[PDB]
Write a protein that binds this ligand. Structure first.
Ligand SMILES: [Cl-]
Ligand SMILES: [Cl-]
Ligand SMILES: [Cl-]
Length: 616
């Protein structure tokens, strides 16, 4: 009925601005001197050259990299094609590059960039030989798929009705030519339907994937020449992805069944199962050279599986260090893969007949990756990664998410490397809510099951606690909810808390920004039966006045336009009411979430600084 701090939802309230000013001041006094000391170490790690997108062309590989304040798109062995710095002297204003694609011949390249934090992006299609900009399209278009003279592309409608007259958010597919533009796909798609197109390997079939929400889809295939003959060949109810049309059959990676991932093929109405469900999730597959190449997610890290087209396992490939493995691009003869891990920013791999390492960036030092399990309330085994340095000062930085079908697999945290070097241990927990063990591993953290995610996390913290570790719990967004909720319930299992860009108010999350999008995950606060399980764990509603709490850092951004800062502000106040040792950090830099590489870098440093100071 009534929320005492509902006024905090107006971020322009001077009471709110005053809170930000005072608290930033507080937090800066607490870790500033330490943060300034650590920053060159974090930046040294953050500023590392890091690959982004890669493409196969007949003239060679084209890939983008991030370095320092710069983003370049370049010939793999050769020249820089696009710089971010050259562009920022074309406008005199700061520019972010978003992504690119090329034609298969490597004569045309299209990329996208937003000048300033301006909402509208821009797309430039340049000739790869002169560097000429043969077209500039504003606003930015996506899915640029070259065919002959023109190309298909998808436009996303955020603010405005689609041409056929449908309210946002919606998406439409087009075809551009010397002649002009025309919508070729999407008419009547109500808001929520999102689409994409990819070519088959031979390039003579279009493959179109419809998605409603983040949950469900249908597949359309047809001649790449004519959209009028793009007929629907598969209809699903749970996340599917179309792999390729090889020799008349559409190969599909589907989580239908138990929800672990299987490969099916469809030819002229008839469905046959190529690769059945395994014990562990099948997260992706690509077809290369009469061989199926598959990413199997064994306990939240990747191993590589090679199958014949008829579904017969030829071999598997394992890695020295547990890492994440994703395809970057593929043609008929080969695939590029991106690998990453805790102390390995990236490896670029090429699979053709064998797996070949063609580029690598790793951080030297005596670092170790181990694994172990915790036992949750109901006996569920909660896997977690362990990263250790040369020495062990018995302090843990424990990262969790647990939701939205998002698997926490090995990745690179720049600010953790100085923490390892200082004798710290990084822990990454695989809680329910994610996709580590399939579609039901996800469902087991949704709605009325959310307390499982918390129970999984406590299981890990309490286990680390029993072993003599000082513990810092950390999470962002849905992870920020994770840490706030675990805080209100078991403050005894952690020596400090780091709560980032969090959802806190579980009864009003749907009224703020785009929060209603999370209703399938969390529940509906407008339904009294959902409020009953929501009210049981809602951090904003469960701050225990008689419990004694650890140092707690809530952090967010003022112009963050996805996760409303008022969640942070409200929880801060609730902790402050009962005199908890809480701090509040509010980034002042607007525009996109990462203002610049340096502002972000400095924020990560403050996190490390808070951990080091409070775990000492
Ligand atoms: Cl963060
Ligand atoms: Cl989310
Ligand atoms: Cl940020």
């Amino acid at each position: 009925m009534e929320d005492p701090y509902i006024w905090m939802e107006n971020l322009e309230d001077e009471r709110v601005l005053k809170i930000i000013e005072e608290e930033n001041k507080r937090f800066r006094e607490f870790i500033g001197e330490l943060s300034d000391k650590l920053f060159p170490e974090v930046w040294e790690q953050f500023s590392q050259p890091t690959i982004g997108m890669a493409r196969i062309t007949k003239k060679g590989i084209i890939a983008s990299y991030s370095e320092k304040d710069r983003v370049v798109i370049k010939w793999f062995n050769g020249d820089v094609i696009v710089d971010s710095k050259e562009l920022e002297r074309e406008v005199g204003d700061e520019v972010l590059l978003q992504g690119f694609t090329t034609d298969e011949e490597g004569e045309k390249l299209a990329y996208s960039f937003s000048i300033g934090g301006a909402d509208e992006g821009i797309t430039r299609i340049i000739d790869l030989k002169t560097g000429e900009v043969i077209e500039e399209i504003k606003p930015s278009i996506w899915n640029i798929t070259f065919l002959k003279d023109g190309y298909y592309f998808t436009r996303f409608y955020r603010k405005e009705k689609t041409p056929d007259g449908v309210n946002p958010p919606a998406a439409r597919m087009f075809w551009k030519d010397r002649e002009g533009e025309r919508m070729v796909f999407g008419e009547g798609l109500t808001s929520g339907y999102f689409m994409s197109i990819r070519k088959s390997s031979d390039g003579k079939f279009a493959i179109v994937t419809l998605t409603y929400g983040w949950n469900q889809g249908e597949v359309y295939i047809g001649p790449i020449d004519n959209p009028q003959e793009w007929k629907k060949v598969y209809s699903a109810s749970v996340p599917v992805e179309a792999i390729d049309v090889v020799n008349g059959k559409l190969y599909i990676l589907t989580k239908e069944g138990k929800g672990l991932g299987k490969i099916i093929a469809i030819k002229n109405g008839k469905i046959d199962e190529v690769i059945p469900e395994g014990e562990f999730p099948l997260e992706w597959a690509v077809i290369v050279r009469d061989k199926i190449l598959a990413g199997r997610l064994v306990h939240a890290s990747y191993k590589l599986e090679v199958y014949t087209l008829n579904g017969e396992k030829i071999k598997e490939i394992t890695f020295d260090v547990p890492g994440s493995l994703y395809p970057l691009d593929k043609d008929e003869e080969r695939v590029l893969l991106r690998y990453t891990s805790f102390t390995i920013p990236y490896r670029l791999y090429e699979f053709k007949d064998d797996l070949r390492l063609i580029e690598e960036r790793k951080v030297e030092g005596e670092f170790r990756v181990e694994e172990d399990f915790a036992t949750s309330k109901d006996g569920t085994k909660v896997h977690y990664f362990i990263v250790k340095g040369e020495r062990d000062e018995k302090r843990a930085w424990v990262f969790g998410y647990g939701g939205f079908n998002i698997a926490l697999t090995p990745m690179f945290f720049p600010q953790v490397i100085p923490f390892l070097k200082r004798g710290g241990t990084f822990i990454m927990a695989n809680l329910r809510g994610g996709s580590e063990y399939g579609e039901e591993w996800h469902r087991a953290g949704m709605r009325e099951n959310k307390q499982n995610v918390f129970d999984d996390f406590i299981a890990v913290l309490e286990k680390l606690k029993k072993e003599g570790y000082k513990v810092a719990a950390w999470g962002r967004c849905n992870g920020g909810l994770l840490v706030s909720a675990t805080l209100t319930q078991r403050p005894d299992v952690m020596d400090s808390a780091l709560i980032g860009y969090p959802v806190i108010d579980m009864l009003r999350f749907h009224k703020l920004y785009i929060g209603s999008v999370w209703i399938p995950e969390y529940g509906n606060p407008e339904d009294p039966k959902d409020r009953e399980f929501l009210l049981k764990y809602s951090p904003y509603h469960n701050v225990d006045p008689k419990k004694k709490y650890p140092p707690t850092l809530i952090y967010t951004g003022l112009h963050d336009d996805r996760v409303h800062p008022a969640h942070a502000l409200k929880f801060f106040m609730k902790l402050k009411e009962i005199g908890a040792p809480v701090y509040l950090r509010v980034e002042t830099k607007s525009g996109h979430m990462g203002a610049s590489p340096e502002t972000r870098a400095r924020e990560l440093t403050d996190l490390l600084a808070f951990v080091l100071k409070t775990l000492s």
